[PDB]
Amino acid sequence: VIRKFTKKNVARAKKKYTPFSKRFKSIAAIPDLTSLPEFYGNRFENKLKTTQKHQIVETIFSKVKKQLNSSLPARENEFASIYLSAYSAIESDSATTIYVAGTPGVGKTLTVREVVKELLSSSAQREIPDFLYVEINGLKMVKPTDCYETLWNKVSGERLTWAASMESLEFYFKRVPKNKKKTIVVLLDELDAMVTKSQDIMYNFFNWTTYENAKLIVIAVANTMDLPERQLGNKITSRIGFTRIMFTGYTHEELKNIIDLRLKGLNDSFFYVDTKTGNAILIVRKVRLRMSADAIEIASRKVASVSGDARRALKVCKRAAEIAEKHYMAKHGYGYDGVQTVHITHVMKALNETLNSHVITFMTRLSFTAKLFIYALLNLMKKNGSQEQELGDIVDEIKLLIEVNGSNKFVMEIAKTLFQQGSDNISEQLRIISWDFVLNQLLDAGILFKQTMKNDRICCVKLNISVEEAKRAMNEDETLRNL
Amino acid sequence: INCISLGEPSSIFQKIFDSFQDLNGPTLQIKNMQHLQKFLEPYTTFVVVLDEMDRLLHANTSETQSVRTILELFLLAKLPTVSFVLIGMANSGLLPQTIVFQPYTAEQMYEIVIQKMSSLPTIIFQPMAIKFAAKKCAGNTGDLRKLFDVLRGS
Amino acid sequence: LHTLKLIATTMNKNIDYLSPKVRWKVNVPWEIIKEISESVHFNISDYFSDIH
Amino acid sequence: DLSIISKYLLIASYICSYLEPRYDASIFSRKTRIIQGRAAYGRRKKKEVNP
Amino acid sequence: ADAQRSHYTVYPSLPHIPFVKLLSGKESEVNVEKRWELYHQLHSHFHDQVDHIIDNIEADLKAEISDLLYSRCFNTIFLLGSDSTTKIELKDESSRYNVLIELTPKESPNVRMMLRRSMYKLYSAADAEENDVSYDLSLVENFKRLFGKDLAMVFNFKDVDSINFNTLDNFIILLKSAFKYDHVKISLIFNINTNLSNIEKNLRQSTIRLLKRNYHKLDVSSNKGFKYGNQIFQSFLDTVDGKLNLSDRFVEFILSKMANNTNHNLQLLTKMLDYSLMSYFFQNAFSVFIDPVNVDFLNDDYLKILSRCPTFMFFVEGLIKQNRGLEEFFVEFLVRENPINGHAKFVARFLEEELNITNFNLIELYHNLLIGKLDSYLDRWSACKEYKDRLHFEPIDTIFQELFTLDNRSGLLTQSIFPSYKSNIEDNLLSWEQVLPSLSGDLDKIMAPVLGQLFKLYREANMTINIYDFYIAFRETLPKEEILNFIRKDPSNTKLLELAETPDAFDKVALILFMQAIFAFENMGLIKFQSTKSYDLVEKCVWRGI
DNA sequence: TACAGATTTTATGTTTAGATCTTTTATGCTTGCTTTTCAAA
DNA sequence: TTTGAAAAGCAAGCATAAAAGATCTAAACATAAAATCTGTA
Ligand SMILES: Nc1ncnc2c1ncn2[C@@H]1O[C@H](COP(=O)(O)OP(=O)(O)OP(=O)(O)O)[C@@H](O)[C@H]1O
Ligand SMILES: [Mg+2]
């Protein structure tokens, strides 16, 4: 047959369509699912392995940088609340929802994972019954319904399509008796990412916690405390509940304790450093490593002022150690193959490059034509105050600025280059040389905005950057500030 | 039957059939009004309780096609030679009977709480605490779930 | 005449012909209406001679 | 090969498109007034641009 | 309720011809039956000839299109005055494949859809005669590799005067790229309904210069040279020859209506001829005497009706100036030929064959023969000067020939097929006593129907009407005491009596009757509300007689 | 029971019909001023 | 034959309707691999 179009790259999974409600004849026909070899969890790692032919030189700051990587001193009350709710709901065989919200990097996922680890340790001591832990991250899903595919695959071991998985989970949570079940603890991380238009997924996940036979713990980690009030309906907000756990950004003393806990064994300690290569061994010269308490304190105070984000504090300390290690390796010439201190200067330089703006020094290093464009644009904003200027007006005002300051030395040397490219055989041009080039360059830089128009004269252009930093970059130039 | 936990709102008739027919017999394929109407004709009362009946509306389309399935079910629970009694619960001459469930008051919430904890040997709350929790949780448009989380958090 | 696009309307697709909001305009140039008026001996140029 | 009704409708549509409706009674009105009534005076000034 | 649904099917419970009994209901049913059967013989003898004529029209159109089509540029054909309803068939000639690709303006929203539909049609036909492909012009490039044959595409653009000419121009420029492939030849057919000059100014000048390299014009309207309408009129003349005659008013009406229609006046001509035949066989009780077998069934009613004939009136008045015998006279004097149709056919075949006068209409020739001005019709050619005495004819005003005639005096043909629709609506609104009979008797004489009163006050008001002032003007004409007496004359309804007891009853009744009529006027299209959320002023949209 | 074939389910791509919202331009009412033909002296 | 004066026309101003189209979505139209039903061998 002759097709009207073709779909030649269809990749379909081997997922069955029949839900769990048709797996046995009756409710009484359902066996004990705990004594089943595929329920409740009853190969790629070696492809990224090779043989090492050299000996990596780990310098003395490499252990500091390794210990400062992201891979519970400040979360006691949050840990205790989450653990007590989960322990009470597991040991009494009930279903509940715990809500956790906070800004990035305040220890939400780490605290919930530690709670789950301690509950698994308590279930290994036969103090609470066994449970299955499932982690669903909404930003790791391709489609939002794939969470239905994930959770059911973690429960039964089957692979169904998402609608059949949703019916299977509904039948499982509602109809299967508690004597044939295991408790499930589900972490719904990045809860805002699973919010869709119809909000059926959110309703189903929080409504399964209201069923009497469910034995389901849903720990929902969010980014805002008012997500059910802003984005969800009244039905899902009623099911989530009034009790919500806020993870506040860290104060500077807790960030100080976090950084000291990552460096408890390294700070104020001695290393055997081999001066031939640079390789350092933690307990040939005996060198003491030190990072200043003033440096850690000022980085922690800065980070707690900004966000209270532990990732940022660890990254600022790691960047300071990297800067100091770069200077040390440069001054000794070591390569990769008596007191070494990472100081408050390195911490301030790590804190400054994140706060430095390149926009002004980008604009001060442009050519004369791009600066002339920006200067004429600012002149037109001063003349009429419209904040959007047509490109033809910019052309006319560039021409005006050339013919008005014609007695200037630099302008009377630049005019032949601008309008004829220094050639007698080239006619006088309506645009300057490199007009399109500097227009497109300022558009790709994000300095400029241009409307989608086909007439080149009446097309409007807007500053995307702030006006005063453009004026500062214009007054930096010698020629433009004199005319 | 919970309507949100179905794949599509058009399959609910089939779901009703998979809620009724014996598994040893022939499992038929059902689309709409007519096949269910033909199936219940030889029969015995069929009670269906449909939680969230409003999400049976199609959120897309228009006013003509969003009220297709609900009107079809209301017509199929109204005509003779069947025994189909339909209960639908949504959130806030053949039109259905309506009972509005009302938000609970403080005394109602109190009586619900002492009735629920009457199975317990002792009561580890002061009754004034339950009364204060009920009067703060009731207000206007109250939910008993909020009172349950307040007491559990206490 | 509307089918041949010799006259046109404000709306081009899904046209409510009976709507009072729908207004109509001619869609022919002056030379076409000149040749048409010459085919029926109607003096259309007399109607525009005194106005500009 | 257009019809006579179609031709006169096209001519009338061209007139309706390119003449202002306030002046039409000063061109087309020709009936005898039983009732006292003042016809339109007509346009005063010519247009500068051919409409 | 079925009145509130969009649509519903009714299978109504049931517990033999549509002709009724004439002669004041003293006609016999067997004469009704043979009236029905005679109408069907005349209708069938007309429509078999009409069907043969229509098949001949499409046959010679196909022949002329194929002759102009097959006897590095396009082969362009402009079918002028084409309704795009002609089925073009290409030849079957070996070592080359001929594809007809039909494109409509609905099928042409842009050039990409035009090319995709054309290439799908090309690949479908080439697969249907004797691996998937991309539906673009490279299939035209690779056609000889994929099918082993040369390619001839004929593009038939249906209803060109409705297409976007920018899209059509770009599609033709796109099709120009296939000229370099050495095995492809392209023909374009444009079905034009306005004029060639209109489509000239809607295309680019380079596209015109491309189309000018090889193009032909083919004019096929519905009455190109009058040759096809003359056949339909002559077949109608032959089906009533010696049986019925045409008045000059009927032929004049036919010519006037065919002048008002451009593309579809052949079917319009057939439509009024069949409706006139229907009206005669439904109206005239004497149509049974169309058959000369039924003449023995005369009655006193037949002789009483046929005595009121103006030609027989003049004949007996001339006899007095100078029943059984009347029966024999009526039998004997309806036999003769009435040779106007034979003479019209003789003049038509004399002008068409001998003088080669081919741009003549038979209908105006028959009109001039009916009014006796065949010389005044013939002297417009300056070629039959030597035969004016040869083709001279004068009609014989035979008696009771109006009992067997097709004539337009009642305006039944005007009311049925071409009514003054808007004028009839306005006349019925303004003068409702010609609608409603003049038979709650006190109120029906003293107060008009509300729609008619509303239209009377509507007609004498300005372009912009304030509806409060309009409602006061409507209220001043209604009688108060008679309305209050009429509203209290239903004692079973107590809410009516309670509302009539209120002192503001007449204002409320007037407002209710006013608002119902105002919404009726808005639904009919007479009035237009200014704003959506004001509803305080209306504009008249409709004036009577214009 | 196994199994080839037919249909369903799930899943996605293609094209047309129509809705909504924004932006710019026509247009209708207000009000004051100048010209003009028509019903009485 | 005048009169004059009330209707008609001009024009600036301004609120507002509407034309045009950018952006988008529903629905009709279309394809397809895996699973599931289905009638026999
Ligand atoms: N109390 C802590 N003690 C030690 N390290 C911590 C602590 N809190 C956070 N960190 C460090 O910061 C990292 C970020 O924490 P986590 O992943 O829990 O953040 P989060 O609140 O879930 O953030 P996001 O919303 O971006 O996912 C941890 O992996 C860990 O390295
Ligand atoms: Mg996290």
Residue D26 CB lies within 7 Å of the nucleic strand G: yes
Q: CA–C1' span, A95 to F12, in Å?
A: 38
Q: Are A20 and A171 in contact (CB under 8 A)?
A: yes
Could you give the 3-state DSSP secondary structure of residue E102?
strand
Q: Is A382 on the interface with B (CB under 8 A)?
A: no
What are the tokens at A89? 């709901």
Token look-up 């109504």 returns E12
Restricting to A residues 206-265, those with a Cβ less than 8 Å away from any Cβ of B are: 207, 234-235, 238-239, 241-243
Q: b/e for E405-439, b at 16 or more Cβ within 10 A?
A: ebbbeeeebeeeeeeeeeeebbeebeebeeeeeee
Cα–Cα dist A136/A100, whole Å: 15
Q: Are E384 and E356 in contact (CB under 8 A)?
A: no
Reference E467, options E530, E538, E533, E516; nearest CA is E538
Token look-up 């034995």 returns A215
For the purposes of burial, counting CB atoms within 10 Å of the CB of E172, is it exposed (0-12), middle (13-18) or buried (19 or more)? Answer: buried
What are the tokens at B50? 């449909």
Q: Are B133 and B154 in contact (CB under 8 A)?
A: yes
Cα–Cα dist E155/E114, whole Å: 11
What are the tokens at E441? 């008797």
Could you give the 3-state DSSP secondary structure of residue A191?
helix
How many CA atoms are closer than 13 Å to the CA of B81, on its beta-carbon side?
6
Residue A96, strand partner residues: A217
D-chain residue closest to C38, CA distance: D7
Vertex A367 angle, CA A365 and A370, to 5°: 105
Q: Which chains touch E (3 or more CB pairs under 8 A)?
A: A, C, D
Query: What are the backbone angles phi and psi of residue E202, rounded to the nearest 5°?
Result: -95, 0
Sign of CA dihedral A297, A301, A306, A309: positive
Are E525 and C18 a contacting pair at CB < 8 A? yes
Sign of CA dihedral A166, A167, A173, A178: negative
Reference A152, options A175, A136, A129, A130; nearest CA is A136
Task: Count the neighbouring beta carbons within 10 Å of the beta carbon of residue A329.
Answer: 16
How many D/E residue pairs have CB atoms within 8 Å?
16
Chain A contact set for B153 (CB, 8 A): 242-243
Quick one: DSSP state of residue B110?
A: H
What are the tokens at E515? 């608002």
Strand F nucleotides with an atom less than 7 Å from a protein beta carbon: 8-19, 29, 35-39
Chains B and D touch (3+ CB pairs under 8 A): no
Query: Going by C-beta distance under 8 Å and a sequence separation of 6 or more, which residues neighbour residue E75?
Result: E69, E185, E186, E187, E188, E214
What are the tokens at A134? 């499932």
Q: Are E86 and E65 in contact (CB under 8 A)?
A: yes
Task: Please report the atom of ligand 1 found closest to the CA of residue A102.
Answer: 21
Q: Where on the phi/psi map is residue A399: left (φ > 0), alpha (ψ -120 to 50), or beta?
A: alpha
Are C51 and D9 a contacting pair at CB < 8 A? no
Chain C contact set for D2 (CB, 8 A): 36
Are A239 and B5 a contacting pair at CB < 8 A? no
Cα–Cα dist E101/E181, whole Å: 19
Could you give the 3-state DSSP secondary structure of residue E289?
helix
Cα–Cα dist A415/A404, whole Å: 12
Q: Are E75 and E185 in contact (CB under 8 A)?
A: yes
Are E528 and C20 a contacting pair at CB < 8 A? yes
Q: Are A223 and A249 in contact (CB under 8 A)?
A: no
DSSP E192-257: ESS-HHHHHHTS-HHHHHHHTTSEEEEE--TTGGGHHHHHHHHHHHHHTTTT-EE-HHHHHHHHHH
* Residue A422 marked as a ligand binder: no
